[PDB]
Design a protein around this ligand. Structure first.
Ligand code: CL
Ligand code: CL
Ligand code: NA
Ligand code: NA
Lengths: 552, 552, 61, 61
């Protein structure tokens, strides 16, 4: 099958309406991939320990947050990961879906590898390189259907496939965490100089050691140029994702109080009846009156989260994740889990930009009703008295354990049986799409890194690597390795299907839509999604869930 | 399928007579094509701005007509366009059809690509080049069936395939217009020096930006050496094209006036009855008499067109097209839309000719009854008096708005409900054959650039390009691109079918036929269509619609 | 008076790479498309200005 | 949005722009291929170039 293609390139997004507002979005994605031989032929147990006593080391006082120490199993295999919005839709698609649909769900996933080509490189004189075809050479493929091997979402480290169809990409090298004891003590710059920082890493433990190899756990297919490989279709079992945001906060839940009379002019206000004589209910029985702020609501929309909370286990210190909610007027970023990420040119960064530094963006939850304005928050002693003297009210300013900047809001946890909140927004195009659930008896109500969590087993990971291309001289009992310089290219097609539903339209007023404009320096300027004079592209994160929706 | 051909070369024109004068002309065309890799791997938004203050720039006073500024989307794809008479018939065929047929219509179109070959180039020492086969390499093909992408008739810029079967050709690179604001002010050489010329180009607009990619809109087929690709048959839906010209002008419509007596000798004239006593009708009731010139005719054959009218939109100034009619005795070229075009050696120019300059030819409408002799035209004030004093008649000489060379005929529009005219002539071999209709609610009664306009959807455009042939070292996060030097060759066969009808023959006198002769320096000298001592060819535009036909 | 007017309409295709121009509303004071124009006043005064249409561009040839 | 100036095959640029701020140039008017309806001048230009039809038109006002 040498001179015949084994597949079809297709990167078009097709919409099929079944009627009644239901839509079958079928996203085809194809890319040309490049795979080079592994630097090492075997599996390595690598360790990373940044315990320098200067700069961003862990030995310098107060540098816990900079910790990067861990151990990993480095494998000669590579992973083909397309789990990221940017791989399947072009900007316009995302816009169209966000502006017209109100619901979206995963349906099925399929992939195939085809048109494999393997080449060898040899030298010449002047020295120039020459490229030849190794027709008989092959490429190894493996598919972990049952997810035996460690799950490693490439989207988390901007290592998925490129978001540009006409540009080539490459698979990310496979590696996974290995257990290793890790202890690091807490210190501050103010902390005494004589104080010694404990920075330790231990030996591999029997109770937690897990070394897996692709060779020993999965069946492997060999692909020569005339071969091709298919995964067959996988069926998703996940919950629908709302494509709208909520705005009603506790202050907007239920029957608004009855105004006494209609405003007298277009600029006037209206007044309610006296607090003392108004009907209603409160949960503070020390005061005989009702007020929008004291009034009993059905439940609590949103909640206070501990920030910037760091916890520690055998592995080391780590920042506890927080539910991405609205950052409010006050713009309390860390308190409401805003997410900031850095990515490469393959995933959005302007191709024109130069320097090692990646592009960075901070994602602020679309929803406006579940965030928390730490500044304006406060707790009043009871029996409650209004107004309260400084000794019967704890607020932002007040300091905990005599620390100027540590306020109660930093360690306050408001989560409770009455807490209700929306689901994290999907992030085009850098966002991860689906995720494997944690194998623990008691699971989390959601994940921060992805909108769709597989209730059952998630689609299996696709692994590839070049077959060792040996030379004429080879000795097994020698650690020395000689291999012919080889590399390969091949195409990848994937088919992701969604089930989506068109939105209803009942408000009298026009609704907020995701648009583009011509105003210079505007975030939504058309010029950002067009090519430059030399073809440089730029794909910034797009808004989503533009349309508002009743919460109650 | 390495060592086996995947198609057949065929460039013969076959005539099948079904009887009753109906003919099925099946034109087979085949060419060997050459495709090199694109200079750039991606899509570019290129701009052209000739705003120099010297020479043919737009900044120099009175140089509007020289404007070339515009913006375009440059793509790494190439287009295979065979939409031009020269691709399907050899001179003799065209002659035979023009001399014997009276009607011609498009029936069906089919095409295929086959016998693909891809080669790589490497260096050597002395340095010489070496060519090798990349058996596993492939070529990309895409067919836009629904005409989603911008229609770009290659015939308009002499970029279709070559008109010589035994000579190789290459596809034209694909590119399309992109919206960009453009303003240019009007000035004349006489115009004051201090006067400043406004020459502006704006930023991409949100309301009119359309960036398409082949990858995202069409399914793409990969062709390795042993593969081949077919379009299947497309059926045309167009109106028939008359292969005759008309000669009757308003002066020859209807009952000629009755002569009083037959001429007395072979050199004598005959006379009609006195104007004052002749029967008939006119539309000028100030004079009591009829005359061939005043006499009422059924309708108006031909009409006055504004020339050389330039109009302006956001895009810029442009020459308004005009219906190609007869240029009359007076030879008023621009007033009757004569078409002049410049073409290369691949499309007619004498191969022997040397210099960058292309060959140029001016096409004068075959029809002799719808043109306008601006010089002899005139308007008479009414009530009409004959003869008219200089103040009651506007003629050529008179100047508009005190401008010596601007005469009324320059801005006069005679088009009206009574206007009737023939269809533009087909032009062998440089002429375009069919054309896509404009997607506007109210369409034009015809196109100037083509005789056949598709009532429905036109045949889709055929796109090709080489697959990026990567090297051993590749980095995605780098803007740097390294590719192996590659190029390819492949054959293209096309089958175009026409339905034509043999002409009737009723005149007593022999009729005008398209012939060839031996008279030196004659436009129709046989020597022009023969090869030179070293094989240099020359294919000049051939006459068409030689036979005259009754108009009424 | 009750009236019933029926239309037959077709959903649009989406093929451009770049996001397309949409008719939107905003919060910028004194903007022609400010939300406040389509809401009632404190005493119920309404205001309905002409809305844009045919926002999406389309190939002509 | 396409006006007479944006109808058909754009002229072929000689080379791709050298930088993100540069322009590209076409081949000399005198040597460029194409067609016009003004046969007094031996050259083609976006403004003189023959288009299929006339989009829009002048109205008496
Ligand atoms: Cl799968
Ligand atoms: Cl076709
Ligand atoms: Na913050
Ligand atoms: Na003329």
């Amino acid at each position: 099958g040498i001179g015949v293609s084994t597949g079809t390139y297709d990167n078009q997004t097709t919409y099929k309406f079944l009627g009644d507002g239901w839509v079958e979005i079928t996203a085809h994605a194809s890319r040309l991939l490049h795979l080079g031989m592994p630097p090492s032929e075997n599996y390595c147990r690598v360790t990373v320990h940044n315990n320098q006593t200067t700069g961003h080391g862990t030995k310098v006082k107060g540098n816990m947050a900079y910790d990067d120490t861990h151990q990993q199993i480095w494998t000669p295999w590579s992973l083909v990961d397309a789990n990221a919005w940017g791989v399947w839709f072009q900007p316009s698609d995302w816009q169209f879906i966000q502006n017209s649909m109100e619901s979206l769900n995963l349906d099925s996933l399929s992939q195939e590898l085809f048109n494999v080509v393997v080449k060898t490189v040899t030298e010449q004189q002047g020295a120039i390189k020459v490229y030849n075809n190794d027709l008989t050479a092959c490429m190894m493929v493996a598919l972990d259907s049952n997810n035996i091997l460690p799950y490693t979402p490439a989207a988390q480290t901007s290592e998925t496939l490129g978001f540009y169809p006409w540009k080539p990409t490459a698979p990310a090298p496979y590696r996974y965490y290995f257990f290793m004891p890790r202890q690091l003590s807490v210190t501050s710059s103010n902390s005494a100089e004589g104080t010694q920082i404990t920075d330790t890493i231990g030996e591999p433990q029997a109770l937690n050691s897990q070394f897996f190899t692709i060779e020993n756990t999965l069946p492997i297919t060999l692909l020569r140029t005339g071969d091709e490989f298919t995964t067959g279709t996988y069926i998703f079992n996940t919950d629908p994702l709302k494509l709208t945001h909520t705005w009603q906060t506790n202050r907007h839940l239920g029957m608004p109080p009855r105004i006494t009379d209609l405003p007298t002019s277009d600029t006037a206000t209206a007044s309610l009846t006296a607090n003392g004589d108004r009907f209603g209910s409160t949960q503070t029985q020390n005061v005989n009156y009702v007020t929008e702020a004291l009034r009993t609501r059905p439940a609590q929309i949103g909640f206070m989260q501990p920030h910037d909370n760091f916890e520690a286990n055998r592995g080391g210190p780590f920042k506890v994740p927080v539910v991405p909610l609205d950052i409010t007027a006050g713009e309390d970023h860390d308190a409401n889990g805003a997410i900031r990420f850095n990515y490469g040119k393959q995933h959005g960064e302007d191709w024109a930009k130069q320097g090692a530094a990646p592009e960075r963006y901070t994602w602020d939850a679309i929803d406006s009703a579940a965030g928390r304005d730490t500044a304006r928050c406060f707790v009043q002693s009871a029996p409650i008295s209004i107004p309260p003297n400084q000794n019967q009210i704890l607020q932002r300013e007040d300091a905990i354990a005599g620390r100027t900047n540590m306020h109660y809001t930093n360690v306050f946890n408001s989560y409770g049986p009455l807490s209700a909140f929306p689901h994290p927004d999907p992030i085009y195009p850098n966002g991860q799409i689906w995720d494997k659930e944690l194998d623990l008896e008691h699971k989390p109500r959601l994940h921060v890194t992805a909108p769709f969590v597989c209730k059952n087993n998630p689609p299996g990971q696709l692994f590839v690597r070049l077959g060792p291309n040996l030379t004429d001289q080879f000795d097994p009992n020698s650690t020395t390795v000689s291999r012919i310089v080889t590399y390969s290219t091949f195409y990848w097609k994937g088919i992701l299907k969604f089930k989506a539903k068109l939105r209803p339209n009942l408000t009298w007023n026009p609704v907020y839509q995701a648009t583009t404009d011509s105003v210079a320096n505007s975030y939504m300027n058309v010029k950002k999604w067009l090519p430059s004079a030399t073809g440089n592209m730029h794909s910034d994160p797009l808004i989503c869930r533009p349309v508002p929706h009743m919460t109650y």
